[PDB]
Design a binder for this molecule. Structure first.
Ligand SMILES: C[As+](C)(C)CCO[C@@H](c1ccccc1[N+](=O)O)C(F)(F)F
Ligand SMILES: C[As+](C)(C)CCO[C@@H](c1ccccc1[N+](=O)O)C(F)(F)F
Ligand SMILES: C[As+](C)(C)CCO[C@@H](c1ccccc1[N+](=O)O)C(F)(F)F
Ligand SMILES: C[As+](C)(C)CCO[C@@H](c1ccccc1[N+](=O)O)C(F)(F)F
Ligand SMILES: *[C@@H]1O[C@H](CO)[C@@H](O)[C@H](O)[C@H]1NC(C)=O
Ligand SMILES: *[C@@H]1O[C@H](CO)[C@@H](O)[C@H](O)[C@H]1NC(C)=O
Ligand SMILES: *[C@@H]1O[C@H](CO)[C@@H](O)[C@H](O)[C@H]1NC(C)=O
Ligand SMILES: *[C@@H]1O[C@H](CO)[C@@H](O)[C@H](O)[C@H]1NC(C)=O
Lengths: 532, 528
């Protein structure tokens, strides 16, 4: 039967689901590892041991333990991102959507959810993989990885809490895909890992980590990059935070063994409630437990690896949104409300840069300020708001991604760059927030194809070509369909630096994406802060 | 007669000079100090000893010893600034233009030529005061002062070469005016000192210096302020330069006096031939011997004085030109030519910026570059040319003056700021230089009123309103005569455009760039 599959470790029984007046197979909650519970909390993932009988894969699994957001209870805009299942430490599962007539050996795309390495679920409505699996005829997989302290507490030197175990969870599901996707009609030599935000950084980190390299063919990064200021810490900082988490819990701090034995006894929520307490400064777009440059998952520093071409050389498709930082300013900066135009005053502008570039001396702060202020009209609330928005988006997403794209292209085999600037007609967030962090996702997954969601006809078309670019890239390594009458998305080269706009207007090609500001962030400020 | 005046130190006789089909009186080459020659080289000036008989003041005096520009032999554009009279260390004279018939006790304006303190003359054609004196019925006086080593060699502590003597020359000119201008029909109580460039910085220095404050009423600064980076040096830097000057001429360096005596022996030209050698950095818009903050003429640091408000509180009218830096880049930077559009490659731009901010470290240069570069079009030869032009003009003239204007206004009794951006229809320099440093002067001096100079009627109009603004401001402390030229206030920061079109009132003159040059970069270099 189409729904019953003999995987290496056991039988899996999926379920038939409707998709736009049709059907496709869905295998939900398939486990790829032993439950990281008990004395396993904080440790490297272990492979799921074989089971007898048939594993019921007709329902989504649990979401991993995480800080649930409660800023706007009941508001769909914020809660669509929260865990929609029971949060359990037993959460290492992956889901697969296989087109009906099971494909013989087709393209595979593995989705890696993002959420600052502190949150995220594979089960959210926006990650329903049926539309893309059905429409583009690909085997769509969404995996899951431990987040926060569970997946990232790093006491470098300890084999109980080495750090980067969340990244290792991802690697294991990728291995699982490599060892079993062939039984679902997937081609393990043609898999594309794609993710957004922490999911976008994770993808880049797999392109850098030797132990992950041969588990996938190509890569797609959305609004995320391995070198993002928030995507990783030094092993020192990692250890520091691990000890501070333990201090915050009255933990015996004698040795790593004792700190870990303590933390392992606390109930999950106990760790979450103190999670943000370990950060260095009051900030936005900064998360407590994230990947550590250990010299194992990451042989050396990310920049050293980038300069030496010590990474997987394949094709990559990647991009950013127009207003990546508004989501964060709304939550942590003064003057920002979802119920108002949020015209920011000079006073709150200052307060906001301080929160956005937490690790910058006053000379730094002045530079960022001078760089984004119109001193001819510095009391303009609209400009101050948009100025600060750009600051958070440029510093945390766009420039880090642009630095990575320029480094990678030197050694890569094909790079395609996009700029998502479409504001959805049915957006629930206020207009000032613009094209929000995470909002190209519903288009990558094809939610506009379902009528009852109210997207315009032009939004259905945008989604369809975005999904086609993604699937065609995953299939061939070039998002453009051979000999088509459509507009060409050109290769991004270190010389021409071309990229395109992803929106309703007829495609347009641009060059040097936000160079001016990114020379500032990627070149000047680092040098200014280095000279101290 | 009207051409024979009894001054306090002796008689003097001028001459009747024609002006626009009318006449006015001219007293030229009036000595106001003892010839600072021989032993008196580098020494403070000494008042002019009285004389018997009448002093012939019918012709212009010698010009002070200075580096003569030979970049364009015979080109009027640069030749018009070179000494047009025979040079001589005996050059402390002043000129006066008195409207005819002689006024009773009218407004007096005293011009202070500018040329980086290393050059300048009171006899240039663009300084002919007979037009302004006549058109606005004012007594116009042009002074002179020592430049280069002769006026600013500085061995602080010594008394044979104390430094700032060139300024004391200026102060003595003003003291002379104070004591005598009433004999020519001018009110010593309503004297305005105005000057351009290094002259403008001097005006500002006499506003700051306690010993100069009481000798004048108001002030006008044209493209220069006392805090300009090229305008002064510490006692140590002055001292360093003085000694290196000696090292260059194989002078004994064992002590202040031996050095000074050795330098006194040398001929004027020997000193000038090695004048530039003392500069600490290869650069542009930098001069060797300039004023020194000695704690005498200047009590404390300029900034310290500006902040505490330790300076003459009165009204000031000042401004700057559209492209102050073109002249400098043309003479010392690669890519710039007088016979081409001078499009600047990225590589020549990089050179240009290092020559422009000689004191900045790499981080600083980087910052200046980021600030003026269009990273989406960095090989645009025009954007790069203009960018450099703006760097030089903003760093050396505009922003130091905007810092002076905002500080002064805090205690002042009335500021009036302008932005001159008209390019003479008959400019002999290439179009890319724009509104060049020093080319507002001909308007202030009404040359556009003499037809043989081929300016346009619309320009004669600009000249006249400008001369009226200057004179009306001189006489009343207000350029307007009851759209009007609005007062500059730290709240609205308004200023006007000075050109042929109808007056426009703007606000916050080059605030973006100047926040960079006055606040950011300083704090950056200071830290690093
Ligand atoms: C496709 As998402 C990486 C779950 C867009 C928002 O998520 C941000 C965020 C930013 C600012 C405030 C709140 C949140 N949030 O609740 O998720 C974060 F943190 F997950 F990255
Ligand atoms: C004890 As808290 C006021 C949940 C520390 C971080 O707060 C952030 C934040 C809060 C919730 C999700 C994501 C973010 N973030 O990415 O910065 C902000 F924005 F509220 F300050
Ligand atoms: C040995 As030389 C070539 C007389 C040092 C300065 O030269 C300047 C210069 C020359 C003449 C007048 C002013 C300037 N200046 O302000 O920099 C420039 F431009 F040639 F490099
Ligand atoms: C009204 As003027 C202050 C005598 C014109 C500009 O003069 C500059 C200059 C700048 C670059 C090259 C040559 C010169 N120059 O011969 O005067 C300097 F140096 F005098 F200020
Ligand atoms: C799998 O479990 C779900 C939920 O309990 C149920 O709806 C489905 O029928 C189950 N499959 C079978 C028949 O085991
Ligand atoms: C990718 O690699 C192939 C074979 O090594 C080469 O022919 C092609 O030029 C490369 N493509 C790019 C754009 O790097
Ligand atoms: C005044 O000086 C001029 C020029 O030096 C000379 O030609 C003239 O004869 C002199 N007049 C008298 C009588 O001193
Ligand atoms: C100048 O000072 C006088 C006397 O105190 C004062 O009345 C006048 O308002 C001041 N003018 C300005 C514009 O500061």
């Amino acid at each position: 039967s189409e729904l019953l599959v003999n995987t290496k470790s056991g039988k899996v029984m999926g379920t038939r689901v409707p998709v736009l007046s049709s059907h496709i197979s869905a295998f939900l909650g398939i486990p790829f590892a032993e439950p990281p519970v008990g004395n396993m909390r904080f440790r490297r993932p272990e492979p799921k041991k074989p089971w007898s009988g048939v594993w019921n894969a007709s329902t989504y699994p649990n979401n991993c333990q995480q800080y649930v957001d409660e800023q706007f209870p009941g508001f769909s805009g914020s809660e669509m991102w929260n865990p929609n299942r029971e949060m359990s430490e037993d959460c290492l599962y992956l889901n697969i959507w296989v087109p009906s007539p099971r494909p013989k050996s087709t393209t595979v795309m593995v989705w890696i959810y993002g959420g600052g390495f502190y949150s995220g679920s594979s089960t959210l409505d926006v990650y329903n993989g049926k539309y893309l699996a059905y429409t583009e005829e690909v085997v769509l997989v969404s995996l899951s990885y431990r987040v926060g302290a569970f997946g990232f507490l790093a006491l470098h030197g300890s084999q109980e809490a080495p750090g980067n175990v969340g990244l290792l969870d991802q690697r294991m599901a990728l291995q699982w895909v490599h060892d079993n996707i062939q039984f679902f009609g997937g081609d393990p030599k043609t898999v594309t890992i794609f993710g957004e935000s922490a999911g976008g950084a994770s993808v880049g980190m797999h392109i850098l980590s030797p132990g992950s390299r041969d588990l996938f063919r190509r890569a797609i990064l959305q609004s995320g990059s391995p070198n993002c200021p928030w995507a990783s810490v030094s092993v020192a900082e990692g250890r520091r935070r691990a000890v501070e988490l333990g201090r915050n819990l009255n933990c015996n701090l004698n040795s790593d063994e004792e700190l870990i034995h303590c933390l392992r006894e606390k109930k999950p929520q106990e760790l979450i409630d103190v999670e943000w307490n370990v950060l260095p400064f009051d900030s936005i777009f900064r998360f407590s437990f994230v990947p550590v440059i250990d010299g194992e998952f990451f042989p050396t520093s990310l920049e050293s690896m980038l300069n030496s071409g010590n990474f997987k050389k394949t094709q990559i498709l990647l991009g950013v949104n127009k207003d990546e930082g508004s989501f964060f300013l709304l939550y942590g900066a003064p003057g920002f409300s979802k119920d108002s135009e949020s015209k920011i005053s000079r006073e709150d502008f200052m307060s906001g840069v301080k929160l956005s570039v937490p690790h910058a001396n006053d000379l730094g702060l002045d530079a960022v300020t001078l760089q984004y202020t119109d001193w001819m009209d510095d009391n303009n609330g609209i400009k101050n708001r948009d100025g600060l928005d750009d600051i958070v988006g440029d510093h945390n997403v766009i420039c880090p991604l642009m630095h990575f794209v320029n480094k990678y292209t030197k050694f890569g085999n094909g790079t395609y760059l996009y700029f998502f600037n479409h504001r959805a007609s049915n957006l629930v967030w206020p207009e000032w927030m613009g094209v929000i962090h995470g909002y190209e996702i519903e288009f990558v997954f094809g939610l506009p194809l379902v009528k009852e969601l109210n997207y315009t006809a032009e939004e259905e078309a945008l989604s369809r070509r975005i999904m086609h670019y993604w699937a065609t890239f995953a299939k061939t390594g070039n998002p453009n369909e051979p000999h088509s009458q459509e507009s060409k998305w050109p290769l991004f080269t270190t010389k021409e630096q071309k990229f395109i706009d992803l929106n309703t207007e007829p495609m347009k090609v641009h060059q040097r994406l936000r160079v001016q500001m990114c020379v500032f962030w990627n070149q000047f400020l680092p040098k200014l802060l280095n000279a101290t």
